[PDB]
Design a protein around this ligand. Structure first.
Ligand SMILES: CC(C)(C)c1nc(-c2cccc(NS(=O)(=O)c3c(F)cccc3F)c2F)c(-c2ccnc(N)n2)s1
Length: 274
């Protein structure tokens, strides 16, 4: 509303427009995805994979329901059964993220080589930000339209896994749509991603997205619960970058022993094909 400059309001409008056009919140176009079948190293890969045990539910348009419960680790390959499905979901999410960036004027004006570097740097993080908006913290469930992913009761022991503590702590802030898309912009325009050339312009763009966020919070959120909301959000973005670097290493480890990354995932994670 008011309290923001015209450039700031236009900035938020452009991000909201881009989010509206490229985030399929009902996941209606996520289709033809794979499903789990009807050294050590392997030790590290086994703990890498048992962190996020999730059950899966699919509600058919006709009213039927399929439910999938994963196996326990039995020292064998059953730990890989969800990877093809998660790869297809990640790939679907990444395409929406790429379309989000491409619709935004500030991003489209950078050199293409820096566009690519920025997308490689932040695709994971924008994916997690979008998933948080469909996260139900009461049921521990990501509600993706006809699909649901539910954490398997194994509990603050779950809040020990950094991605999961991230989703609960971010949901707790009860952000608006505008604050989520500003979080996405700040993360997308990070001057320090590997291989970025235009450090100073990306940093100025980022600073302007951060300032718009701080001003949006100050003019629209006077309640004592939202004191320091801006700084809490920025601490969450720092944590999410840390989560990004751990899960990049985790993906490359799993990929080393059990290949699964899609071609789009390989491009974003720097896998060359040889
Ligand atoms: C749908 C739901 C339940 C919320 C999930 N999303 C992701 C998730 C979130 C963000 C990005 C990617 N895909 S990814 O390509 O970034 C990636 C993997 F697919 C696998 C391992 C690491 C990794 F970074 C994801 F799979 C999940 C995820 C993330 C990392 N590892 C595992 N095993 N699952 S689980």
């Amino acid at each position: 509303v008011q309290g923001l400059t015209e450039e700031q309001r236009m900035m938020i409008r452009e991000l909201m427009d881009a989010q509206m056009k490229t985030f399929d919140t009902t996941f209606s176009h996520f289709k033809n995805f794979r499903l789990p079948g009807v050294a050590a190293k392997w030790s590290q890969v086994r703990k890498d994979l048992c962190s996020l045990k999730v059950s899966l539910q699919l509600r058919g348009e006709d009213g039927s329901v399929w439910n999938y419960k994963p196996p326990a680790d039995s020292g064998g390959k059953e730990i890989f059964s969800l990877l093809p499905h998660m790869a297809d979901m990640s790939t679907y999410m990444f395409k929406g993220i790429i379309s989000f960036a491409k619709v935004i004027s500030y991003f489209r004006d950078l050199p293409i080589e820096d566009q690519i570097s920025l997308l490689k740097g932040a695709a994971f993080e924008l994916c997690q930000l979008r998933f948080n908006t469909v996260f139900n913290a009461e049921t521990g469930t990501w509600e993706c339209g006809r699909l649901s992913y539910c954490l398997e009761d194994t509990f603050q022991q779950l809040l020990l896994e950094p991605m999961l503590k991230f989703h609960y702590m971010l949901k707790k802030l009860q952000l608006h749509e505008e604050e989520y898309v500003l979080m996405q912009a700040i993360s997308l325009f990070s001057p320090d991603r590997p291989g970025v050339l235009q450090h100073r312009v990306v940093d100025q763009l980022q600073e302007q997205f951060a300032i718009t966020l701080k001003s949006y919070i100050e003019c629209n959120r006077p309640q004592p619960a939202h004191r320091f909301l801006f700084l809490k959000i920025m601490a969450m973005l720092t944590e999410l970058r840390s989560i990004n670097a751990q899960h990049t290493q985790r993906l490359l480890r799993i990929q080393d022993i059990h290949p699964f990354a899609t071609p789009l995932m390989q491009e974003l994670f720097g896998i060359t094909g040889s």
